[PDB]
């Protein structure tokens, strides 16, 4: 049966985290 | 005895005066004297009970040294209130003969 | 590289992560701007001069 290589899963997780990370005294904390 | 002054055409250093009676210490650095006065008076305050009698005098003295724009009338009113209470010691120009009278 | 008689280039992805703290510092400054202030002295007319 079909398999999922670990590189693809790692890339999925890393890209998902990086999208949220890059795209963002109380007012100054807001983006 | 209430004034300390030096005078000379070219500064005269009297070798017979001797060592002064001051001690070298360290403290916070202030840009102006008003800052030092306000800081020391505020430190004196906030350790006194709200019912203490001299607290209004401390507050008046503190407010006398506050500087800002558009505070002429308020400062004059506070100074008059302090003068009529025998705390300001009129500086012998017009209020020693008008406000005190 | 040549890569079988061509010039395909290496993929060069960019994920900028060093600008967040710089933006935070810039926003911190722009939230509380500072200017020049003149303090009075111990004179009868220094207050009006400073004003």
CSV table of N, CA and C in Angstrom, one decimal:
chain,number,residue,atom,x,y,z
A,1,UNK,N,0.8,-1.2,0.0
A,1,UNK,CA,0.0,0.0,0.0
A,1,UNK,C,0.9,1.3,0.0
A,2,UNK,N,0.2,2.4,-0.2
A,2,UNK,CA,0.9,3.7,-0.3
A,2,UNK,C,1.5,4.0,1.0
A,3,UNK,N,2.6,4.8,1.0
A,3,UNK,CA,3.3,5.2,2.2
A,3,UNK,C,3.5,6.7,2.1
A,4,UNK,N,3.8,7.3,3.3
A,4,UNK,CA,4.1,8.7,3.4
A,4,UNK,C,5.6,8.9,3.9
A,5,UNK,N,6.4,9.4,3.0
A,5,UNK,CA,7.8,9.7,3.4
A,5,UNK,C,7.9,10.7,4.5
A,6,UNK,N,8.9,10.6,5.4
A,6,UNK,CA,9.0,11.5,6.5
A,6,UNK,C,9.4,12.9,6.1
A,7,UNK,N,10.1,13.1,5.0
A,7,UNK,CA,10.5,14.4,4.5
A,7,UNK,C,9.2,15.2,4.2
A,8,UNK,N,8.2,14.6,3.6
A,8,UNK,CA,7.0,15.4,3.2
A,8,UNK,C,6.3,15.8,4.5
A,9,UNK,N,6.2,14.9,5.5
A,9,UNK,CA,5.5,15.3,6.7
A,9,UNK,C,6.3,16.4,7.5
A,10,UNK,N,7.6,16.3,7.5
A,10,UNK,CA,8.4,17.3,8.1
A,10,UNK,C,8.2,18.7,7.4
A,11,UNK,N,8.2,18.7,6.1
A,11,UNK,CA,7.9,19.9,5.3
A,11,UNK,C,6.6,20.5,5.6
A,12,UNK,N,5.5,19.6,5.7
A,12,UNK,CA,4.2,20.1,6.0
A,12,UNK,C,4.2,20.8,7.3
A,13,UNK,N,4.7,20.1,8.3
A,13,UNK,CA,4.7,20.7,9.7
A,13,UNK,C,5.5,22.0,9.7
A,14,UNK,N,6.7,22.0,9.1
A,14,UNK,CA,7.5,23.2,9.1
A,14,UNK,C,6.9,24.4,8.4
A,15,UNK,N,6.3,24.2,7.2
A,15,UNK,CA,5.6,25.2,6.5
A,15,UNK,C,4.4,25.7,7.2
A,16,UNK,N,3.6,24.8,7.8
A,16,UNK,CA,2.5,25.2,8.6
A,16,UNK,C,2.9,26.1,9.8
A,17,UNK,N,3.9,25.8,10.5
A,17,UNK,CA,4.4,26.6,11.6
A,17,UNK,C,4.9,27.9,11.1
A,18,UNK,N,5.7,27.9,10.0
A,18,UNK,CA,6.3,29.1,9.5
A,18,UNK,C,5.3,30.1,9.0
A,19,UNK,N,4.2,29.7,8.3
A,19,UNK,CA,3.2,30.6,7.9
A,19,UNK,C,2.6,31.4,9.0
A,20,UNK,N,2.3,30.7,10.1
A,20,UNK,CA,1.7,31.4,11.3
A,20,UNK,C,2.8,32.2,12.0
A,21,UNK,N,4.0,31.8,12.0
A,21,UNK,CA,5.1,32.6,12.7
A,21,UNK,C,5.3,33.9,12.0
A,22,UNK,N,5.5,33.8,10.6
A,22,UNK,CA,5.9,35.0,9.9
A,22,UNK,C,4.8,36.1,9.9
A,23,UNK,N,3.5,35.7,9.7
A,23,UNK,CA,2.4,36.6,9.6
A,23,UNK,C,1.9,36.9,11.0
A,24,UNK,N,2.7,37.6,11.8
A,24,UNK,CA,2.4,38.0,13.1
A,24,UNK,C,2.3,36.8,14.1
A,25,UNK,N,1.3,50.3,25.9
A,25,UNK,CA,2.2,49.3,25.4
A,25,UNK,C,1.4,48.1,24.7
A,26,UNK,N,0.1,48.1,25.0
A,26,UNK,CA,-0.7,47.1,24.4
A,26,UNK,C,-0.8,47.2,22.8
A,27,UNK,N,-0.9,48.5,22.4
A,27,UNK,CA,-1.0,48.7,20.9
A,27,UNK,C,0.2,48.3,20.2
A,28,UNK,N,1.4,48.5,20.8
A,28,UNK,CA,2.7,48.2,20.1
A,28,UNK,C,2.8,46.7,20.0
A,29,UNK,N,2.2,45.9,20.9
A,29,UNK,CA,2.3,44.4,20.7
A,29,UNK,C,1.5,43.9,19.5
A,30,UNK,N,0.5,44.6,19.1
A,30,UNK,CA,-0.4,44.2,18.0
A,30,UNK,C,0.4,44.4,16.7
A,31,UNK,N,0.0,43.6,15.7
A,31,UNK,CA,0.7,43.7,14.4
A,31,UNK,C,0.1,44.7,13.5
B,1,UNK,N,25.5,85.8,58.1
B,1,UNK,CA,26.0,84.4,58.2
B,1,UNK,C,25.1,83.5,57.3
B,2,UNK,N,24.1,84.1,56.8
B,2,UNK,CA,23.1,83.4,55.9
B,2,UNK,C,23.5,83.4,54.4
B,3,UNK,N,24.7,83.9,54.1
B,3,UNK,CA,25.2,83.9,52.7
B,3,UNK,C,26.6,83.5,52.7
B,4,UNK,N,26.9,82.7,51.6
B,4,UNK,CA,28.3,82.3,51.4
B,4,UNK,C,28.7,82.8,50.0
B,5,UNK,N,29.8,83.6,50.0
B,5,UNK,CA,30.1,84.4,48.8
B,5,UNK,C,31.7,84.4,48.7
B,6,UNK,N,32.1,84.5,47.5
B,6,UNK,CA,33.5,84.8,47.2
B,6,UNK,C,33.6,85.9,46.2
B,7,UNK,N,34.6,86.7,46.3
B,7,UNK,CA,34.8,87.9,45.4
B,7,UNK,C,36.2,88.3,45.2
B,8,UNK,N,36.5,88.6,43.9
B,8,UNK,CA,37.9,89.0,43.5
B,8,UNK,C,37.8,89.5,42.1
B,9,UNK,N,38.7,90.5,41.8
B,9,UNK,CA,38.9,90.8,40.4
B,9,UNK,C,39.5,89.7,39.6
B,10,UNK,N,40.5,89.0,40.1
B,10,UNK,CA,41.0,87.7,39.7
B,10,UNK,C,40.9,86.8,40.9
B,11,UNK,N,40.3,85.6,40.7
B,11,UNK,CA,39.9,84.7,41.8
B,11,UNK,C,41.0,84.6,42.8
B,12,UNK,N,40.7,84.9,44.0
B,12,UNK,CA,41.7,84.9,45.1
B,12,UNK,C,41.4,83.6,45.9
B,13,UNK,N,42.5,82.8,46.2
B,13,UNK,CA,42.4,81.6,46.9
B,13,UNK,C,43.1,81.8,48.3
B,14,UNK,N,42.4,82.0,49.3
B,14,UNK,CA,42.9,82.2,50.7
B,14,UNK,C,43.4,80.9,51.3
B,15,UNK,N,44.7,80.8,51.4
B,15,UNK,CA,45.3,79.5,51.9
B,15,UNK,C,45.0,79.3,53.4
B,16,UNK,N,44.6,80.3,54.1
B,16,UNK,CA,44.3,80.2,55.5
B,16,UNK,C,42.9,79.7,55.8
B,17,UNK,N,42.0,79.5,54.8
B,17,UNK,CA,40.7,79.1,55.1
B,17,UNK,C,40.6,77.7,55.6
B,18,UNK,N,41.4,76.8,55.0
B,18,UNK,CA,41.4,75.4,55.4
B,18,UNK,C,40.3,74.5,54.8
B,19,UNK,N,40.3,73.3,55.2
B,19,UNK,CA,39.3,72.3,54.7
B,19,UNK,C,37.9,72.7,54.9
B,20,UNK,N,37.0,72.5,53.9
B,20,UNK,CA,35.6,72.7,54.0
B,20,UNK,C,35.0,71.7,54.9
B,21,UNK,N,33.8,71.9,55.3
B,21,UNK,CA,33.0,71.0,56.2
B,21,UNK,C,32.0,70.2,55.4
B,22,UNK,N,32.3,69.8,54.1
B,22,UNK,CA,31.4,69.0,53.3
B,22,UNK,C,32.1,67.6,53.1
B,23,UNK,N,31.2,66.7,52.8
B,23,UNK,CA,31.7,65.3,52.5
B,23,UNK,C,31.2,64.9,51.1
B,24,UNK,N,32.1,64.2,50.4
B,24,UNK,CA,31.9,63.7,49.1
B,24,UNK,C,31.1,62.4,49.1
B,25,UNK,N,29.9,62.4,48.4
B,25,UNK,CA,29.1,61.2,48.4
B,25,UNK,C,28.6,61.1,46.9
B,26,UNK,N,27.7,60.2,46.7
B,26,UNK,CA,27.0,59.9,45.4
B,26,UNK,C,25.5,59.9,45.6
B,27,UNK,N,24.8,60.2,44.5
B,27,UNK,CA,23.4,60.2,44.5
B,27,UNK,C,22.8,60.1,43.1
B,28,UNK,N,21.5,60.2,43.0
B,28,UNK,CA,20.9,60.2,41.6
B,28,UNK,C,21.3,61.5,40.9
B,29,UNK,N,21.4,61.4,39.6
B,29,UNK,CA,21.7,62.5,38.7
B,29,UNK,C,20.5,63.2,38.2
B,30,UNK,N,20.4,64.5,38.4
B,30,UNK,CA,19.3,65.3,38.0
B,30,UNK,C,19.7,66.4,37.0
B,31,UNK,N,18.8,66.6,36.1
B,31,UNK,CA,19.1,67.7,35.1
B,31,UNK,C,18.9,69.0,35.7
B,32,UNK,N,17.9,69.2,36.5
B,32,UNK,CA,17.6,70.5,37.2
B,32,UNK,C,17.5,70.3,38.7
B,33,UNK,N,17.6,71.5,39.4
B,33,UNK,CA,17.4,71.4,40.8
B,33,UNK,C,16.0,71.1,41.2
B,34,UNK,N,15.0,71.6,40.4
B,34,UNK,CA,13.6,71.3,40.7
B,34,UNK,C,13.4,69.8,40.8
B,35,UNK,N,14.0,69.0,39.9
B,35,UNK,CA,13.9,67.6,39.9
B,35,UNK,C,14.3,67.0,41.3
B,36,UNK,N,15.5,67.5,41.8
B,36,UNK,CA,16.0,67.0,43.1
B,36,UNK,C,15.0,67.4,44.2
B,37,UNK,N,14.6,68.6,44.2
B,37,UNK,CA,13.6,69.0,45.3
B,37,UNK,C,12.4,68.2,45.2
B,38,UNK,N,11.8,68.0,44.1
B,38,UNK,CA,10.5,67.3,44.0
B,38,UNK,C,10.8,65.8,44.4
B,39,UNK,N,11.9,65.2,43.9
B,39,UNK,CA,12.1,63.8,44.3
B,39,UNK,C,12.3,63.6,45.8
B,40,UNK,N,13.1,64.5,46.4
B,40,UNK,CA,13.3,64.4,47.9
B,40,UNK,C,12.0,64.6,48.7
B,41,UNK,N,11.2,65.6,48.2
B,41,UNK,CA,10.0,65.9,48.9
B,41,UNK,C,9.0,64.8,48.8
B,42,UNK,N,8.9,64.2,47.6
B,42,UNK,CA,8.0,63.0,47.3
B,42,UNK,C,8.5,61.8,48.1
B,43,UNK,N,9.8,61.6,48.2
B,43,UNK,CA,10.3,60.5,49.1
B,43,UNK,C,9.9,60.8,50.5
B,44,UNK,N,10.0,62.0,51.0
B,44,UNK,CA,9.5,62.4,52.3
B,44,UNK,C,8.0,62.1,52.5
B,45,UNK,N,7.3,62.4,51.5
B,45,UNK,CA,5.8,62.1,51.4
B,45,UNK,C,5.7,60.6,51.2
B,46,UNK,N,4.5,60.1,51.2
B,46,UNK,CA,4.1,58.7,50.9
B,46,UNK,C,4.5,57.8,52.1
B,47,UNK,N,5.3,58.3,53.1
B,47,UNK,CA,5.6,57.6,54.3
B,47,UNK,C,4.8,58.2,55.5
B,48,UNK,N,3.9,59.1,55.2
B,48,UNK,CA,3.2,59.8,56.3
B,48,UNK,C,1.7,59.5,56.2
B,49,UNK,N,1.1,59.4,57.4
B,49,UNK,CA,-0.3,59.1,57.4
B,49,UNK,C,-1.2,60.2,56.8
B,50,UNK,N,-2.3,59.8,56.2
B,50,UNK,CA,-3.1,60.8,55.5
B,50,UNK,C,-3.7,61.9,56.4
B,51,UNK,N,-3.7,61.6,57.7
B,51,UNK,CA,-4.3,62.5,58.7
B,51,UNK,C,-3.2,63.4,59.3
B,52,UNK,N,-1.9,63.3,58.8
B,52,UNK,CA,-0.8,64.1,59.3
B,52,UNK,C,-1.1,65.6,59.0
B,53,UNK,N,-0.6,66.5,59.9
B,53,UNK,CA,-0.9,67.9,59.7
B,53,UNK,C,-0.1,68.6,58.7
B,54,UNK,N,1.2,68.2,58.5
B,54,UNK,CA,2.1,68.9,57.6
B,54,UNK,C,2.0,68.4,56.2
B,55,UNK,N,1.2,67.4,55.9
B,55,UNK,CA,1.0,66.9,54.5
B,55,UNK,C,0.5,68.0,53.6
B,56,UNK,N,-0.4,68.9,53.9
B,56,UNK,CA,-0.8,70.0,53.0
B,56,UNK,C,0.4,70.9,52.7
B,57,UNK,N,1.2,71.2,53.7
B,57,UNK,CA,2.4,72.0,53.5
B,57,UNK,C,3.4,71.3,52.5
B,58,UNK,N,3.6,70.0,52.7
B,58,UNK,CA,4.5,69.3,51.8
B,58,UNK,C,3.9,69.3,50.4
B,59,UNK,N,2.6,69.1,50.2
B,59,UNK,CA,2.0,69.2,48.9
B,59,UNK,C,2.1,70.6,48.3
B,60,UNK,N,1.9,71.6,49.0
B,60,UNK,CA,2.1,73.0,48.5
B,60,UNK,C,3.5,73.2,48.1
B,61,UNK,N,4.5,72.8,48.9
B,61,UNK,CA,5.9,73.0,48.5
B,61,UNK,C,6.2,72.3,47.2
B,62,UNK,N,5.7,71.0,47.1
B,62,UNK,CA,6.0,70.2,45.9
B,62,UNK,C,5.4,70.9,44.7
B,63,UNK,N,4.1,71.4,44.8
B,63,UNK,CA,3.5,72.0,43.7
B,63,UNK,C,4.1,73.4,43.3
B,64,UNK,N,4.8,74.0,44.3
B,64,UNK,CA,5.5,75.2,43.9
B,64,UNK,C,6.6,75.1,42.9
B,65,UNK,N,7.2,73.9,42.9
B,65,UNK,CA,8.4,73.6,42.1
B,65,UNK,C,8.1,73.0,40.7
B,66,UNK,N,6.8,72.7,40.4
B,66,UNK,CA,6.4,72.0,39.2
B,66,UNK,C,6.4,73.1,38.1
B,67,UNK,N,7.1,72.7,36.9
B,67,UNK,CA,7.2,73.6,35.8
B,67,UNK,C,6.4,73.0,34.6
B,68,UNK,N,5.9,73.9,33.8
B,68,UNK,CA,5.1,73.4,32.6
B,68,UNK,C,4.5,74.6,31.9
B,69,UNK,N,3.9,74.3,30.8
B,69,UNK,CA,3.3,75.4,29.9
B,69,UNK,C,1.8,75.6,30.3
B,70,UNK,N,1.4,76.8,30.5
B,70,UNK,CA,0.1,77.2,30.8
B,70,UNK,C,-0.3,76.9,32.3
B,71,UNK,N,0.7,77.1,33.2
B,71,UNK,CA,0.4,76.9,34.6
B,71,UNK,C,0.6,78.2,35.4
B,72,UNK,N,0.5,79.3,34.8
B,72,UNK,CA,0.7,80.6,35.5
B,72,UNK,C,-0.3,80.9,36.5
B,73,UNK,N,-1.6,80.8,36.2
B,73,UNK,CA,-2.7,81.1,37.1
B,73,UNK,C,-2.7,80.1,38.3
B,74,UNK,N,-2.6,78.8,38.0
B,74,UNK,CA,-2.6,77.8,39.1
B,74,UNK,C,-1.4,78.0,40.0
B,75,UNK,N,-0.2,78.2,39.5
B,75,UNK,CA,1.0,78.4,40.3
B,75,UNK,C,0.8,79.7,41.1
B,76,UNK,N,0.3,80.8,40.6
B,76,UNK,CA,0.1,82.0,41.3
B,76,UNK,C,-0.9,81.8,42.5
B,77,UNK,N,-2.0,81.1,42.2
B,77,UNK,CA,-3.0,80.8,43.2
B,77,UNK,C,-2.4,80.0,44.3
B,78,UNK,N,-1.6,78.9,44.0
B,78,UNK,CA,-0.9,78.1,45.0
B,78,UNK,C,0.0,78.9,45.8
B,79,UNK,N,0.8,79.8,45.2
B,79,UNK,CA,1.8,80.6,45.9
B,79,UNK,C,1.1,81.6,46.8
B,80,UNK,N,-0.1,82.1,46.4
B,80,UNK,CA,-0.8,83.0,47.3
B,80,UNK,C,-1.3,82.2,48.5
B,81,UNK,N,-1.9,81.1,48.3
B,81,UNK,CA,-2.4,80.2,49.4
B,81,UNK,C,-1.2,79.9,50.3
B,82,UNK,N,0.0,79.7,49.8
B,82,UNK,CA,1.1,79.4,50.7
B,82,UNK,C,1.6,80.6,51.4
B,83,UNK,N,1.5,81.8,50.8
B,83,UNK,CA,1.9,83.0,51.4
B,83,UNK,C,1.0,83.4,52.6
B,84,UNK,N,-0.3,83.3,52.4
B,84,UNK,CA,-1.2,83.7,53.5
B,84,UNK,C,-1.1,82.7,54.7
B,85,UNK,N,-0.5,81.6,54.5
B,85,UNK,CA,-0.3,80.6,55.6
B,85,UNK,C,1.0,80.7,56.3
B,86,UNK,N,1.8,81.7,56.0
B,86,UNK,CA,3.1,81.9,56.7
B,86,UNK,C,4.1,80.8,56.4
B,87,UNK,N,4.2,80.4,55.1
B,87,UNK,CA,5.2,79.3,54.8
B,87,UNK,C,6.1,79.8,53.7
B,88,UNK,N,5.7,80.8,52.9
B,88,UNK,CA,6.5,81.1,51.7
B,88,UNK,C,7.6,82.1,51.9
B,89,UNK,N,7.5,83.0,52.9
B,89,UNK,CA,8.5,84.0,53.2
B,89,UNK,C,8.7,84.9,52.1
B,90,UNK,N,7.7,85.9,51.9
B,90,UNK,CA,7.8,86.8,50.8
B,90,UNK,C,9.2,87.4,50.5
B,91,UNK,N,9.6,87.4,49.2
B,91,UNK,CA,10.9,87.9,48.9
B,91,UNK,C,10.9,89.4,48.6
B,92,UNK,N,10.3,90.2,49.5
B,92,UNK,CA,10.6,91.6,49.6
B,92,UNK,C,10.5,92.4,48.3
B,93,UNK,N,9.5,92.0,47.5
B,93,UNK,CA,9.3,92.8,46.3
B,93,UNK,C,8.0,93.6,46.2
B,94,UNK,N,6.9,92.8,46.3
B,94,UNK,CA,5.6,93.4,46.4
B,94,UNK,C,4.6,92.7,47.4
B,95,UNK,N,4.8,91.4,47.6
B,95,UNK,CA,3.9,90.6,48.4
B,95,UNK,C,4.2,90.7,49.9
B,96,UNK,N,5.3,91.2,50.3
B,96,UNK,CA,5.6,91.5,51.7
B,96,UNK,C,4.7,92.6,52.2
B,97,UNK,N,4.3,93.5,51.4
B,97,UNK,CA,3.5,94.7,51.8
B,97,UNK,C,2.1,94.7,51.3
B,98,UNK,N,1.7,93.8,50.4
B,98,UNK,CA,0.4,93.7,49.9
B,98,UNK,C,-0.4,92.5,50.3
B,99,UNK,N,0.1,91.3,50.0
B,99,UNK,CA,-0.5,90.1,50.4
B,99,UNK,C,-0.5,89.9,51.9
B,100,UNK,N,0.7,90.1,52.5
B,100,UNK,CA,0.7,89.9,54.0
B,100,UNK,C,0.0,91.0,54.7
B,101,UNK,N,0.0,92.2,54.2
B,101,UNK,CA,-0.8,93.3,54.8
B,101,UNK,C,-2.3,93.0,54.7
C,1,UNK,N,24.3,24.4,-11.8
C,1,UNK,CA,25.2,23.5,-12.5
C,1,UNK,C,24.7,23.3,-13.9
C,2,UNK,N,25.5,22.5,-14.7
C,2,UNK,CA,25.2,22.2,-16.0
C,2,UNK,C,24.0,21.4,-16.1
C,3,UNK,N,23.9,20.3,-15.4
C,3,UNK,CA,22.8,19.4,-15.2
C,3,UNK,C,22.2,19.0,-16.5
C,4,UNK,N,23.1,18.2,-17.2
C,4,UNK,CA,22.8,17.6,-18.6
C,4,UNK,C,22.6,18.8,-19.6
C,5,UNK,N,23.6,19.6,-19.7
C,5,UNK,CA,23.7,20.6,-20.7
C,5,UNK,C,22.6,21.6,-20.6
C,6,UNK,N,22.4,22.2,-19.4
C,6,UNK,CA,21.4,23.3,-19.2
C,6,UNK,C,22.0,24.2,-18.1
C,7,UNK,N,21.2,25.1,-17.6
C,7,UNK,CA,21.7,25.9,-16.5
C,7,UNK,C,20.6,26.1,-15.4
C,8,UNK,N,19.9,25.0,-15.1
C,8,UNK,CA,18.9,25.1,-14.0
C,8,UNK,C,19.6,25.5,-12.7
C,9,UNK,N,19.0,26.4,-12.0
C,9,UNK,CA,19.6,27.0,-10.8
C,9,UNK,C,19.0,26.4,-9.5
C,10,UNK,N,19.7,26.6,-8.4
C,10,UNK,CA,19.3,26.0,-7.2
C,10,UNK,C,18.1,26.8,-6.7
C,11,UNK,N,17.1,26.1,-6.1
C,11,UNK,CA,16.0,26.8,-5.5
C,11,UNK,C,16.5,27.5,-4.2
C,12,UNK,N,16.0,28.8,-4.1
C,12,UNK,CA,16.5,29.7,-3.0
C,12,UNK,C,15.3,30.3,-2.3
C,13,UNK,N,14.7,29.6,-1.4
C,13,UNK,CA,13.5,30.0,-0.6
C,13,UNK,C,14.0,30.9,0.5
C,14,UNK,N,13.1,31.9,0.8
C,14,UNK,CA,13.4,32.9,1.8
C,14,UNK,C,12.3,33.0,2.8
C,15,UNK,N,12.6,32.8,4.1
C,15,UNK,CA,11.6,32.8,5.1
C,15,UNK,C,12.1,33.9,6.1
C,16,UNK,N,11.7,35.1,6.0
C,16,UNK,CA,12.2,36.2,6.8
C,16,UNK,C,11.6,36.1,8.3
C,17,UNK,N,12.5,35.9,9.2
C,17,UNK,CA,12.2,35.7,10.6
C,17,UNK,C,12.9,36.7,11.5
C,18,UNK,N,13.7,37.6,11.0
C,18,UNK,CA,14.5,38.5,11.8
C,18,UNK,C,13.9,39.9,11.9
C,19,UNK,N,12.8,40.2,11.2
C,19,UNK,CA,12.2,41.5,11.2
C,19,UNK,C,11.1,41.7,12.3
C,20,UNK,N,10.7,40.7,13.0
C,20,UNK,CA,9.6,40.8,14.0
C,20,UNK,C,10.1,41.7,15.1
C,21,UNK,N,11.3,41.4,15.7
C,21,UNK,CA,11.7,42.2,16.8
C,21,UNK,C,12.1,43.6,16.4
C,22,UNK,N,12.6,43.8,15.2
C,22,UNK,CA,12.8,45.2,14.6
C,22,UNK,C,11.5,45.9,14.5
C,23,UNK,N,10.4,45.3,14.0
C,23,UNK,CA,9.1,45.9,14.0
C,23,UNK,C,8.6,46.2,15.4
C,24,UNK,N,8.8,45.3,16.3
C,24,UNK,CA,8.4,45.6,17.7
C,24,UNK,C,9.1,46.8,18.3
C,25,UNK,N,10.4,47.0,18.0
C,25,UNK,CA,11.1,48.1,18.5
C,25,UNK,C,10.6,49.4,17.9
C,26,UNK,N,10.4,49.4,16.5
C,26,UNK,CA,9.9,50.5,15.8
C,26,UNK,C,8.5,50.9,16.3
C,27,UNK,N,7.6,50.0,16.6
C,27,UNK,CA,6.3,50.3,17.1
C,27,UNK,C,6.4,50.8,18.5
C,28,UNK,N,7.3,50.3,19.3
C,28,UNK,CA,7.5,50.8,20.7
C,28,UNK,C,8.0,52.3,20.6
C,29,UNK,N,8.8,52.6,19.7
C,29,UNK,CA,9.2,54.1,19.6
C,29,UNK,C,8.1,54.9,19.1
C,30,UNK,N,7.4,54.5,18.1
C,30,UNK,CA,6.3,55.3,17.5
C,30,UNK,C,5.1,55.4,18.4
C,31,UNK,N,4.9,54.5,19.3
C,31,UNK,CA,3.8,54.7,20.3
C,31,UNK,C,4.1,55.8,21.3
C,32,UNK,N,5.4,56.0,21.7
C,32,UNK,CA,5.8,57.0,22.6
C,32,UNK,C,6.9,57.8,22.0
C,33,UNK,N,6.5,58.9,21.3
C,33,UNK,CA,7.5,59.8,20.7
C,33,UNK,C,8.0,60.8,21.7
C,34,UNK,N,9.3,61.2,21.6
C,34,UNK,CA,9.9,62.2,22.5
C,34,UNK,C,10.4,63.3,21.7
C,35,UNK,N,10.5,64.5,22.3
C,35,UNK,CA,10.9,65.7,21.7
C,35,UNK,C,11.8,66.5,22.7
C,36,UNK,N,12.1,67.7,22.2
C,36,UNK,CA,13.0,68.6,23.0
C,36,UNK,C,12.2,69.4,24.0
C,37,UNK,N,12.6,69.5,25.3
C,37,UNK,CA,12.0,70.3,26.3
C,37,UNK,C,13.0,71.2,26.9
C,38,UNK,N,12.6,72.5,27.2
C,38,UNK,CA,13.5,73.5,27.8
C,38,UNK,C,13.1,73.6,29.3
C,39,UNK,N,14.0,73.5,30.2
C,39,UNK,CA,13.8,73.6,31.6
C,39,UNK,C,14.1,75.0,32.1
C,40,UNK,N,13.3,75.5,33.1
C,40,UNK,CA,13.6,76.8,33.6
C,40,UNK,C,14.8,76.8,34.6
C,41,UNK,N,15.3,78.0,35.0
C,41,UNK,CA,16.3,78.1,36.0
C,41,UNK,C,15.7,78.8,37.3
C,42,UNK,N,16.6,79.2,38.1
C,42,UNK,CA,16.3,79.9,39.4
C,42,UNK,C,16.4,81.4,39.1
C,43,UNK,N,15.4,82.0,38.4
C,43,UNK,CA,15.4,83.4,38.1
C,43,UNK,C,13.9,83.8,38.1
C,44,UNK,N,13.7,85.1,38.2
C,44,UNK,CA,12.4,85.7,38.3
C,44,UNK,C,11.6,85.5,37.0
C,45,UNK,N,12.4,85.5,35.8
C,45,UNK,CA,11.7,85.5,34.5
C,45,UNK,C,12.1,84.3,33.7
C,46,UNK,N,12.7,83.2,34.3
C,46,UNK,CA,13.1,82.1,33.5
C,46,UNK,C,12.0,81.2,33.0
C,47,UNK,N,10.9,81.2,33.7
C,47,UNK,CA,9.7,80.4,33.3
C,47,UNK,C,9.1,80.9,32.0
C,48,UNK,N,8.9,82.2,31.9
C,48,UNK,CA,8.4,82.8,30.6
C,48,UNK,C,9.4,82.6,29.5
C,49,UNK,N,10.7,82.7,29.7
C,49,UNK,CA,11.7,82.4,28.7
C,49,UNK,C,11.6,81.0,28.2
C,50,UNK,N,11.5,80.0,29.1
C,50,UNK,CA,11.4,78.6,28.8
C,50,UNK,C,10.1,78.4,28.0
C,51,UNK,N,9.0,79.0,28.4
C,51,UNK,CA,7.7,78.8,27.7
C,51,UNK,C,7.8,79.3,26.3
